[PDB]
Design a protein around this ligand. Structure first.
Ligand code: CPL
Ligand code: CPL
Ligand code: I8P
Ligand code: I8P
Ligand code: I8P
Ligand code: I8P
Ligand code: CLR
Ligand code: CLR
Lengths: 578, 574
């Protein structure tokens, strides 16, 4: 029943081009039926063409299966040699060995699913051809060729799988088959894994509560001592980022972008997009409750300043919660990633590290708000001293994410030794640093006229232009891999696009072009006191736009990275054991 | 992976005892492995016992499959004969061909169910034998599977397959003018039971509506605590409707979890049946609208818009949500609800089925809605003495209260006329007529309480005696003729029937106690609402009791459906 959708949902993305072209065969059959009027010879010629195409596709599948089987055999030999060496040596090495064996087992299961799905598609398409042509020649062809093809008659995959299970359960699990077959089981993968009903119900309940509380907050603020906007902007931006990240995960899963492999996550257990949605909904519920408490102040004895403190403390505890509950695995992974990012020079820069550093760079408003709150607590508790003046530490705090990204680029240059990409990327962060420094200098000289304020203004404008152009060019050319000379039909894009619509690509181009300038203006204003009157409003309005731009950029960067992965037909992590 | 859960979910409840008892073999194997200590002799004895049990189960499956194959062949022959007769016969013909199409679809579904039975039994046998081989570290379970399971009549008979093929051919050739696609659009059998999870969007919408409803209720309580028309008497009807929909969604979920084939009992379509999730969604949306209307009444932000429009609109929309001609929102279940309502409100002119009686009982548990509609009409007619409609009783009020009881009584009379079985329908008619007697005597007492007739006490005593009579009648029929409890064959289900499908008997005992208490409360509430009686606290007591009546009817739906599935209490099937 509707094998096309099943194949599309179950196809391994990295091997998408190597599967049965079921939709193409359906289109050919329908076109032949429509163009049918001498009729017998026309049908015979169409059948000959169909059989030639089927032979070509079968040869393609056979070749790909042979290459992947050879790769699996080589990986098995290497893993066996490494296991023998480790046994001869006889903690972290054993853990890496288990991870590598699990990855190899996943690869074997993926190849087995590839072969099974290809056979099923062959059978289904041949049956459909027989039904359309009212002839049984398709079944005869299937028996003659499809059922005798090497990709089917080759049972090496199953025996290799069994040998892997035996090795894992004997030499790694101490002869226990219960501990084995659990690390390596390969449950349903891709987009064919429905989420729990209770999770969806919780997502909906949280979304509804958040919507009602937002409506109530708007109504109260329109109908009814501490800067609430500055305090709560960070939380609002975090909730919006989590929601858009859930959307990003959903889109990656739908479009086949294997972010699981890109982020080096666990293929067997993953956090679904609805989990992110429910986390965002719960955090938004807490944020709205805190804001409503601040507005109405229900508990008179309890002051108004403790509500945001409790909200943020609960958020921090939830992220840090040592107990093995509330997505403890994902939270620990995120904590490790954050530790690696904030200490970038001392760890190798993987895709996850740079990606999270970019996310933080798009969320610098949270750090700015935290620093402003610290300043307000230290000094205010001259009205508005923190807002009326800017200092060097403010600029350093603003550039901290840019510093992290720049030093990550430097570390990547040191490791890979390739100069062009890493140095150019480190150059964009350098133009970002030069911008904030010049803005801060201009703001400092404005109050204390040093007679060089206009020179600094001109320099800041120039560097603003340079930084905006640098970031936009890097986003559209390198991060998104667009504007490539290899694109024939996809003008202003690359040869292969994973997402269905090119209009989406064009809209993303336009929105990124506008929002890069918007974000540059927002950061320049926030980092200093250029616009002391309305600057807070501009920053508040622009920060959600920055998060939206980061969300689109995540979409397209992950798409480009997934396309690069597809180029090498790499569907599993490369695990090296020390 | 976990075949036990998959089997339990995919078992057809009607044939539940007829499937391989995977759990029994699991427990037997686990106990044998746990009690193992000489050792070879014990292992051989256990193997002999296990294979004897396997052979017994295989023979059971074979006999059941033979019985069902014979039944399928008989049904196919009868349907083919009926189709031949219909073809030779050629408004009445249109209905005949429609009924033949429906019967062919039902027979195809039965064939698909038998095929699924075959496949599931074979899979379970193979998996349990594989587990036995793994536990006993031997290669004998597979040998026995090949020797017996793989050559057994149930697994070696392809008769059912050609039966399905012949059914498809016959349908496509004699009921669709040769169109395969049209025939398959109705013959195709999607997964049944818990096999198909509800749509993700459906669950998300249910949760969204639940959250919106909860927050709106909190806001409504806060507004009422802090902050021309009786809001209680105008909104309790909608509140009761929402509560009834929510509890009916719970009832559907419990029926699906307990293996009660309510689809067959209500004669619904097995290929596409409304689930508890949709009922929860509808209840949540209606609750959102109700809360918004009541918030508007409490606040009345818009001044040009009067307050009285807010209730009306809501109810109006509810009407527009049930009589919507377009095929937009639950059209297939709304039209089936409209036809059932038309049949119930015209009871004496239709063959009373299970759906009609069930909906009439639901209305008997939702008479407060009709009473409040009549009270709103009274308020509009006269009040708009101030409370002239609350301070008096009239025959219209009594007949409005009795309407559901009148419908049930006429349904029972029609059932007696058709089936010709005196006892059940006549006793039910007397049970429903006790309601007429109680209501009319209460109305007379209230009417005479205003003037010194000197007959107030005799009428009060008659009302008390008939109240007791009606309460006892209703309770006894609920506990002995609806739930089928207090049966003589209570070997280990004391105070219950021989066989019970719900997990716990504590549920049954709590249900009995709740049924008694809430039947008394319902009778008292009908007495309060039908007349003046209490002139001050009547409204509050009625409002408090009506949700209890809805809950009691919800538990009654549970147990009535259970007894119907287990026994033909209503005699609605051959
Ligand atoms: C001040 C800076 C604020 C923090 C910075 C902003 C956001 C950080 C959160 C998430 C970004 C990471 C997203 C990864 C992208 C892949 C998609 C995915 O979500 O994939 C997930 C992993 O990722 C996540 O679940 C991310 C965790 C999100 C939890 C939410 C915590 C929020 C805490 C709020 C902070 C409060 C601060 C106070 C405010 C002043 C795959 O799931 P798995 O279970 O296979 O995970 C892997 C686990 N193995 C490897 C063992 C299987
Ligand atoms: C005193 C005033 C009025 C009181 C309230 C009146 C009626 C509501 C009561 C019951 C509703 C039916 C319950 C179904 C029980 C069987 C189990 C099941 O779940 O069966 C459902 C039947 O779904 C229903 O009927 C609809 C459920 C209820 C939806 C509510 C719609 C809006 C109503 C507005 C209220 C109107 C008054 C205005 C307010 C003053 C299975 O659906 P299917 O699609 O298989 O249907 C079969 C369709 N084939 C046979 C063609 C495939
Ligand atoms: O009866 P019909 O005509 O409505 O459906 C037929 C056919 O569709 P057709 O009309 O030719 O275009 C198949 O493709 P389709 O439309 O679903 O696929 P697309 O997604 O559009 O590619 C369908 O599913 P499947 O074979 O692809 O999985 C299959 O159903 P089913 O009994 O489950 O077959 P099995 O899976 O058990 O073999 C039927 O095959 P017949 O035995 O030849 O009648
Ligand atoms: O297999 P590892 O050793 O590489 O990793 C496992 C190891 O901890 P590690 O990470 O190495 O520090 C286990 O403890 P350990 O060293 O005493 O002994 P083992 O050799 O595992 O028997 C721990 O508890 P346990 O589950 O096994 O009882 C388990 O927790 P986890 O499944 O998260 O969660 P829970 O089920 O505990 O709640 C880890 O599984 P993963 O992190 O998913 O790989
Ligand atoms: O845990 P492991 O990995 O060491 O052994 C598991 C394995 O047994 P295996 O060696 O092939 O015989 C599964 O087979 P599988 O899915 O690959 O099947 P196929 O070959 O593809 O058909 C079997 O599932 P299954 O038989 O119900 O389908 C599963 O049964 P379990 O969950 O108990 O569920 P129950 O049936 O008892 O309810 C076993 O779990 P455990 O015995 O609890 O440890
Ligand atoms: O269930 P039933 O068979 O007892 O009654 C069906 C019948 O309605 P009636 O009582 O005569 O007014 C159909 O019209 P009809 O006589 O021309 O003939 P057919 O039964 O089709 O031969 C109608 O299709 P429509 O003409 O409006 O599209 C269809 O509704 P609806 O789902 O919208 O139909 P679809 O979108 O699935 O096609 C009804 O349910 P179902 O067939 O199960 O679907
Ligand atoms: C601001 C103006 C000029 C342009 C706005 C365009 C926005 C709405 C566009 C830019 C990129 C687009 C996204 C690109 C990719 C996907 C993945 C797909 O599986 C679901 C839709 C989704 C998530 C798109 C939604 C619409 C989107 C966010
Ligand atoms: C406080 C007392 C008197 C009230 C009566 C007890 C109530 C709570 C009892 C009566 C009947 C019971 C239901 C009977 C059957 C089922 C189906 C089962 O699959 C889940 C539980 C569920 C849904 C029960 C929930 C509890 C229930 C509603």
């Amino acid at each position: 029943m509707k094998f096309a959708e099943h194949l599309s949902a179950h196809i391994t993305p990295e091997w998408r081009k190597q599967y049965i072209q079921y939709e193409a065969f359906k289109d050919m059959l329908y076109s032949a039926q429509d163009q049918a009027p001498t009729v017998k010879r026309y049908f015979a010629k169409f059948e000959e063409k169909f059989f030639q195409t089927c032979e070509k596709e079968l040869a393609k599948i056979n070749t790909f299966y042979s290459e992947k089987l050879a790769e699996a055999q080589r990986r098995f030999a290497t893993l066996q040699n490494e296991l023998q060496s480790s046994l001869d040596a006889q903690h972290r090495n054993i853990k890496d060995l288990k991870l590598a064996f699990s990855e190899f087992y996943l690869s074997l299961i993926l190849l087995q699913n590839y072969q099974n799905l290809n056979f099923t598609g062959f059978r289904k398409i041949l049956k459909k051809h027989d039904k359309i042509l009212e002839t049984s020649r398709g079944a005869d062809w299937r028996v003659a060729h499809v059922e005798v093809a090497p990709f089917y008659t080759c049972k090496k995959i199953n025996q290799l799988i069994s040998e892997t299970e035996a090795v894992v359960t004997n030499e790694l699990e101490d002869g226990d088959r219960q501990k084995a077959m659990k690390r390596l089981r390969v449950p349903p993968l891709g987009a064919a894994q429905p989420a729990p009903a209770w999770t969806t119900f919780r997502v909906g309940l949280f979304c509804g509560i958040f919507i009602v509380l937002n409506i109530t907050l708007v109504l109260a603020a329109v109908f009814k001592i501490w800067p609430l906007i500055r305090i709560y902007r960070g939380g609002f931006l975090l909730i919006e980022f989590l929601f858009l990240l859930g959307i990003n995960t959903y889109g990656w899963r739908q479009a086949g972008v294997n972010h699981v492999l890109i982020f080096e996550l666990n293929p067997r257990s993953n956090l679904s997009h609805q989990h992110l949605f429910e986390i965002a909904g719960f955090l938004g519920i807490l944020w709205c409750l805190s804001l409503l408490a601040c507005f109405f102040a229900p508990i008179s004895v309890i002051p108004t300043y403790v509500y945001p403190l409790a909200l943020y403390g609960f958020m921090v505890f939830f992220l840090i919660n040592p107990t093995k509950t509330f997505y403890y695995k994902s939270r620990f992974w995120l904590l490790k990633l954050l530790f690696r990012v904030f200490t970038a020079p001392f760890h190798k820069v993987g895709f996850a590290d740079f990606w999270l550093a970019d996310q933080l760079n798009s969320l610098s408003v949270i750090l700015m708000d935290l620093e402003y709150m610290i300043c307000f607590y230290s000094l205010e508790l001259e009205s508005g001293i923190c807002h009326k003046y800017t200092y060097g530490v403010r600029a350093i705090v603003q550039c901290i994410p840019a510093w992290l990204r720049f030093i990550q680029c430097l570390r990547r240059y040191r490791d890979t030794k390739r100069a062009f990409p890493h140095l150019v990327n480190a150059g964009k962060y350098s133009t970002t640093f030069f911008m904030v420094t010049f803005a801060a200098l201009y703001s400092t000289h404005k109050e204390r006229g040093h007679s060089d304020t206009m020179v600094f203004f001109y320099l800041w404008i120039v560097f603003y232009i340079i930084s905006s152009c640098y970031t936009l060019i890097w986003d559209l050319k390198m991060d998104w891999g667009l504007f490539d000379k290899n694109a024939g039909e996809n003008t202003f894009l690359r040869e292969e696009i994973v997402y269905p619509q090119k209009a989406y690509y064009y809209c993303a181009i336009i929105e990124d072009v506008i929002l890069r300038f918007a974000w540059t203006i927002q950061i320049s204003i926030t980092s200093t006191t250029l616009l002391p009157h309305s600057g807070d409003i501009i920053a508040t309005v622009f920060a959600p736009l920055e998060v939206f731009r980061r969300f689109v950029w995540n979409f397209f960067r992950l798409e480009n990275e997934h396309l690069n992965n597809c180029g090498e037909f790499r569907a599993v992590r490369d695990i090296s054991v020390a």
